[PDB]
Amino acid sequence: SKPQPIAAANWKCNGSQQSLSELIDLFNSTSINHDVQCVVASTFVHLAMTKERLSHPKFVIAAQNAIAKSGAFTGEVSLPILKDFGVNWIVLGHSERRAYYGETNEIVADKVAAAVASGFMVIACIGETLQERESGRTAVVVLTQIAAIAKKLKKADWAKVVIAYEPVWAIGTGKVATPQQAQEAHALIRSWVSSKIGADVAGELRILYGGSVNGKNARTLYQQRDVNGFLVGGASLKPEFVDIIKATQ
Amino acid sequence: SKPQPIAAANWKCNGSQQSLSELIDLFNSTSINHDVQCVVASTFVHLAMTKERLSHPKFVIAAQNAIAKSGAFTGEVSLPILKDFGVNWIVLGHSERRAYYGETNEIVADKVAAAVASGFMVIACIGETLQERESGRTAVVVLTQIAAIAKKLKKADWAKVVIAYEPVWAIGTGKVATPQQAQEAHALIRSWVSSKIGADVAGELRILYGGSVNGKNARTLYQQRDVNGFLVGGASLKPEFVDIIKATQ
């Protein structure tokens, strides 16, 4: 079969106590008969609320970033503080962090290795920018990015990793990648993994699609052979999210 | 005659619910008889616990950083979000932020302007490094730092501003700043404000020392004319912070 899908809500830098609670009541009331792991990535400020109010057994709370070690880094949150707080999932390498907060492939590779070592389940994000896609650099970019992460990880380390493919050009622009494009980027990444890591690994690996996924387009994307779930922005702030969940099995 | 002082605990990237809750306790049991504003800047993750537990009438909580607007900034936390959460104080432009996280003078100044626009009381941070210092550039750097923040505020805005001078040259370098030196950097700032903004603003402005402060050197530092409190790193995670508050008598 396919490995257990994932339907992850990335709330980004948004919400209010009230708006978010709403969402959570919504989610908590939802029924999900199939095997799927739902993840809610809230801002650090609202990790308390969520963790207290989110009761659905199929959902887990996640952070949206972190640094590897506690210390003199004013403004940042480290993995240790996260763990102590009860958080076991984290999103790392987000294109927004890469494009605006100087996160290079190394920096990402590192946070991931560290996160893995501290025992977290990590969603690592990889993907090309409009300009690279237009140059015909898709394969080199994605493969380089994955290989960066791969370096620091050990075989067994893979059981905690979930890869997120997100074509930067599909980010909050409405330009969703076609199922073809999506499946073609996922198969490539997956070939690399069985080639460099092992087919056993490539087979259990969850690879998500991110980039303007919505209630409507979810089903066809999910229908692809190498598409195991989704990493969702905007629609995740809507009840429509529920639809997204239902499209994966 | 000096304005009301401020004793600001910058917990930086540290803390565990256990250790933090104990400090809180200690802090709440403290008898402070003078007019001082005590601020506790915790990680984003700990804001809730912090809010619930601190009960001392003389304490307020603040955050270590923020972005101006909500949106597609994974990992980031904005003003509106903090505003809803009940946080009204913010530390901004911290030397650890300018060093490792790309905060230019221009970024810190827009961040300051937004916070002010939003009602926050802001602790804005400035200070030169060993090199600028070594080279005779102390005043040029400091003044540029203050001016940049100032080209976005109006006179009335200053009622919401607190400046913390950070002796970067003396941090992690092997060096030691004496009281006379803190004082010189502080007077310099005051004269610039006093001169570009107004003498009225100037005499009211709080300029906090952001260097190495312990329970032993606090009073002699407080003893200096243009010294209005401290922005404490390390000693804030220790009971010694209590001697730090008293030193503002």
From Swiss-Prot, chains A, B:
Keywords of the record: Gluconeogenesis, Glycolysis, Glycosome, Isomerase, Peroxisome
PROSITE patterns: TIM_1 (PS00171), TIM_2 (PS51440)
SUPFAM superfamilies reported in the protein's UniProt record: Triosephosphate isomerase (TIM) (SSF51351)
MF annotations from Gene Ontology: triose-phosphate isomerase activity
Membrane-spanning residues: none
Catalytic activity: D-glyceraldehyde 3-phosphate = dihydroxyacetone phosphate
Single Gene Ontology BP annotation: gluconeogenesis
Protein name according to UniProt: Triosephosphate isomerase, glycosomal
Protein species of origin: Trypanosoma brucei brucei
InterPro entries: Aldolase_TIM, TIM_sf, TrioseP_Isoase_bac/euk, Triosephosphate_isomerase, Triosephosphate_isomerase_AS
Pfam families: TIM
